[PDB]
């Protein structure tokens with residue numbers, strides 16, 4: 001059996017393929033295949049994902065083309081390196097993750113060949129940075145549900161760590177499928193070559209930033225900063241009055257001078273000191 | 288005894304120095 | 320004699336079977352508690368949770384009636400609960416040579432041959448559990464079966480039980496099959512080889528074997544092999560104070576969070592009970608700086624392991640961390656209290672652990688109940704009044720249907736912790752001399768890892784130590800002494816179950832008499848008996864009682 | 868001269884206590900409001 | 907400015923209890939979510 005500690009290892013590339021293909025045709029439930037080496041009974045490490053084109057108009061996971069996966073399967077055999085199909089995916093777009101009654105059917109057609117095929121949902125809207133909405137599931141036997149027998153026989157405090165959603169709890173995530181705790185495989189070969197390359201300037205800070213308009217902007221803030229300092233010459237004067245919790249609710253229609261004031265101090269400071277120092281290095285460096 | 292009255296008082300200086308450094312690090316890490 | 324002296328004082332069996340004598344004479348437990356926990360029949364952890372609880376509360380007493388009441392509810396859960404079922408029997412028969420092979424004669428792997436190779440494969444686990452730190456025919460009997468066996472299903476219990484029986488012994492013969500146990504290129508042998516490989520080399524710092532272990536744990540692709548070695552390279556060095564710091568820097572410098580975490584266990588074991596300023600700089604620092612949760616949990620759980628010498632000081636700094644942002648440092652904080660102050664009824668630490676069960680995270684509610692169990696063992700209402708305040712609480716959280724199985728798992732575990740040995744055994748990482756008790760240190764550190772293997776925290780019977788004075792006059796003869804006490808007598812209170820279907824301070828005590836370590840000072844010396852102790856009576860255990 | 872040697876250490880270390888403890892009890896409430904904001 | 911920062915963090919004091927939500931209302935919210943899961 002299983003010990004509900006299954007520990008799926010994937011990649012740093014397949015998630016990129018999942019967000020790209022799940023995002024490009026995003027309002028339709030797009031799908032495809034998962035092409036990775038099946039490591040031993042607990043874990044699975046899927047190192048590649050290749051996408052399948054759709055069938056027709058309509059949000060569905062319609063069918064597979066074994067002409068296409070046969071030709072594509074042996075294509076990288078004689079181009080790149082051999083791998084092995086293990087799983088498959090689809091994409092609940094703006095939903096989250098579960099197994100629908102359509103999804104569990106083609107899931108059921110894929111567990112028959114290998115019993116440890118993987119059901120994978122990606123959710124490319126509700127993801128921001130630390131969220132991705134993946135939660136790879138797999139079917140449980142409904143025969144054992146009729147038996148009233150609780151499966152999966154926990155031997156490790158490793159699976160009951162993430163709490164399932166109430167929306168997937170509405171569905172048959174457990175009564176018909178289970179969650180798997182995952183992580184990601186990265187290395188210093190990948191960390192540096194994406195850290196050192198994403199947001200990098202060239203010679204930009206070694207400029208003067210529109211030398212006539214820097215000081216012009218330096219009045220274009222200060223001028224209304226005077227009147228905002230007059231609001232700071234206004235709002236302090238109704239203190240020692242009604243208690244400041246009323247000064248918390250009461251100020252939701254009209255602006256405060258306090259926060260808006262220290263905002264422009266930061267703006268005018270950072271707008272000036274940078275152009276100041278960058279102006280003075282070039283005197284030394286250039287002659 | 289009275290010889291413990293400075294050794295046991297510098298033991299809490301060994302224990303006392305680290306704390307401002309620890310909350311000094313938590314000054315930035317709560318922002319981060 | 321002086322020729323038999325080395326057998327009397329170096330094998331030391333007359334504390335082993337005499338503590339076993341104290342357990343076969345002193346047994347105050349309850350069936351009604353396990354009948355209360357009987358009502359949760361479902362195919363979840365609960366079977367292993369009950370059969371781990373009676374093993375926790377029946378350590379070394381050889382009482383097979385809480386297991387022999389049925390067969391079907393015991394053998395209901397499968398595939399590792401029978402591994403656990405044959406695992407739990409050896410703690411019940413701990414410290415006894417005879418009733419090891421003869422009761423498990425059913426459970427030899429070549430007699431019955433059932434469909435479960437774990438009921439028959441996990442026996443040698445318990446054979447290591449009985450004869451931990453007792454090297455005899457258990458080494459070579461647990462070695463020759465391991466020369467030719469099945470896959471890593473009998474090799475788990477044989478390898479862990481073999482390294483446990485050969486713990487800290489530096490034996491080349493167990494290092495032999497632990498090499499070929501190590502280089503299997505397999506995941507399921509990772510716990511099998513990685514833990515015992517350090518167990519047999521405890522405190523050895525064999526730098527060629529360190530180079531083999533951390534040199535091997537760089538290219539493998541599985542995680543259990545990266546986990547057993549993570550504790551093993553911590554366990555090969557023990558109490559060095561400077562002789563590991565370049566290695567802690569090396570493992571902490573690595574990008575592997577598991578190996579930085581292993582550097583945290585290794586700096587936890589290189590500074591056992593040690594108030595050293597240098598280790599607690601980076602120890603506390605990486606507890607700030609690091610981003611994986613596991614290394615942060617071990618990092619905040621290094622604190623009581625390096626500072627259990629003074630239990631007054633860690634509630635000043637870990638209370639500060641109980642309100643951390645993540646439930647991992649919130650979780651390891653409560654267990655840092657539970658490893659620092661577990662020997663004392665620390666009213667301050669209970670004051671800290673009171674709101675810890677209120678947090679909406681199930682496992683910090685859990686470890687709140689584990690540390691809440693460790694804080695007050697063998698304590699009846701007068702060291703601190705929160706004992707019976709929590710007796711209703713573990714029942715309160717175990718008899719709800721809407722609770723988590725994990726949240727009640729600290730309760731069903733906490734019953735076996737809390738009623739251990741008939742209130743005859745206790746935890747002690749510390750002797751009266753000042754030297755720490757290293758199998759209880761290894762027992763609690765190995766007891767930490769129930770996350771990644773459930774009977775890996777079955778390694779706890781090394782921590783259960785008695786509190787019983789023993790009188791003696793010859794090599795074998797028991798004396799007849801009956802001394803008494805002076806202070807407030809209610810401190811000698813009992814568990815006293817309820818069983819629903821003018822105050823004596825002269826407590827006369829026999830030779831196998833339980834007593835609290837706080838009650839070591841309240842007693843009266845025997846002055847009117849025929850026997851008079853030549854030793855000033857300050858420590859428990861066994862003493863000469865000179866017949867005058 | 869034990870009154871003017873050993874007891875002269877009692878009077879000095881307390882002055883370091885009297886303001887470094889104030890530094891801590893300031894700084895930890897300063898931590899505590901922000902941690903309440905975090906959770 | 908820095909003196910108005912450093913002469914300022916002593917009235918942080920008596921910050922007694924930042925209770926998360928409750929215990930009774932948390933168990934009642936778990937019971938209401940249990941009714942939502944049963945429904």
Ligand SMILES: [Zn+2]
Pocket residue numbers: 029090091092098100103
């Ligand atoms: Zn779907």
